[PDB]
Design a protein around this ligand. Sequence first.
Ligand SMILES: Oc1ccc([C@@H]2Oc3ccc(O)cc3[C@@H]3CCC[C@@H]32)cc1
Ligand SMILES: Oc1ccc([C@@H]2Oc3ccc(O)cc3[C@@H]3CCC[C@@H]32)cc1
Lengths: 222, 221
Amino acid sequence: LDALSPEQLVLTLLEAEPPHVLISRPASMMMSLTKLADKELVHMISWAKKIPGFVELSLFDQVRLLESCWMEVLMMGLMWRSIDHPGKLIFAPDLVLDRDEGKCVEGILEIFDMLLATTSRFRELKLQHKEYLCVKAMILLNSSMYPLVSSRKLAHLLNAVTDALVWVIAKSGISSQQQSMRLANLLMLLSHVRHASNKGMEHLLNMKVPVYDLLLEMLNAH
Amino acid sequence: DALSPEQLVLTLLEAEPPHVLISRPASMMMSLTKLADKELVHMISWAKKIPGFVELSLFDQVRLLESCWMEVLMMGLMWRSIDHPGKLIFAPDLVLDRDEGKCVEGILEIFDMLLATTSRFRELKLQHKEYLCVKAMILLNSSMYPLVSSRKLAHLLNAVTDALVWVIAKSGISSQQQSMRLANLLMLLSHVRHASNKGMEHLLNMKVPVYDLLLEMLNAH
Ligand SMILES: Oc1ccc([C@@H]2Oc3ccc(O)cc3[C@@H]3CCC[C@@H]32)cc1
Ligand SMILES: Oc1ccc([C@@H]2Oc3ccc(O)cc3[C@@H]3CCC[C@@H]32)cc1
């Protein structure tokens, strides 16, 4: 019970953060992004396994969640590290792209504008490092509906992270009407992250590295 | 004042779209498509009746309407299907159960999302008042751009939120639960959005033109 307490939880998530990912480059832009995603996915699994109780869900839900959230969690990560630099998307330490470079590949420009706009909204709200940690945990725990309709366990966990986020906003010292508004504002943003995630998945499947199959392999590895 | 919690809910209540009968003299998709086109007209009316919507720049109005329509149709579908597991009450003469979804490829998947999301709103015991606020929110939160008149949209979105928060408050539940229920309701918005995208992808992969017809309506005003 206690390891899921608001304070402990935020610190545990903090330590569970993924490492920086160097793509190490010796079609191409899309080759880069794809190789990057594959690499991040490995660390994403590690991350999820470090979230208190995740490992104690049924392997069936762990797999459902991961398979449904990966693109969203990757994009949440992109937005967060691009949060202080308008017009750019810091994908990895050796891969910073600005809006315009998105014109090369067709279809990508639209997605970039979504990501940049959502990032802009997170910068305007002044997203906090610990609010960000809870949100990202929520994106995962809330990626799939089915595993909720072990379900007892997922719901408890999803409530834990939420209490944590509510706790985080509370010590913000702001009023009670604002606390509610900020909670609502942060959550509504999730719809946009999901959205961008869908446009990304769609675009990725309309393509002719196999990230999705590679993810399924990683899912079998465990 | 017209945006004050109690008043706003009653106003949204009166703005509800009428029942829509398709009146049937490929086909399933033909029906669903004829239905959408019809509901879209009433959806515009609905949105205009939301306090202050008509006051946003026509550019924002069009922007919001163009991206939320599918979500609002599905929020409507879920709400009227909420008491009937395994089925989707699309219209008074169009009730489809899950399996009828195997006929058209790609649709069974989407039906299962809608049935699951509806299933969850039933578990949360979504109230008629909450449903009214949530749907307004789906519209007001459909596009990020018009927000990043912006002043106006933000104020509007906050108004509906206060309303929802107000609604949950008179629920008499504790403050920890109030926060949880608010958070539980909002997260469902990601799934509605999700289903909305799957529905759009599918509709565009098809070979009635709802989207163009929508764009026309967007001009008739
Ligand atoms: O950290 C990351 C790493 C990678 C990505 C995705 O990469 C893709 C690859 C191939 C595609 O057809 C689409 C995409 C998504 C559209 C833009 C970025 C997004 C997000 C975040
Ligand atoms: O009230 C309504 C009326 C209509 C709809 C959409 O209709 C479609 C039509 C054509 C398509 O290729 C997909 C769809 C969506 C997939 C299931 C229903 C949804 C939702 C809600």
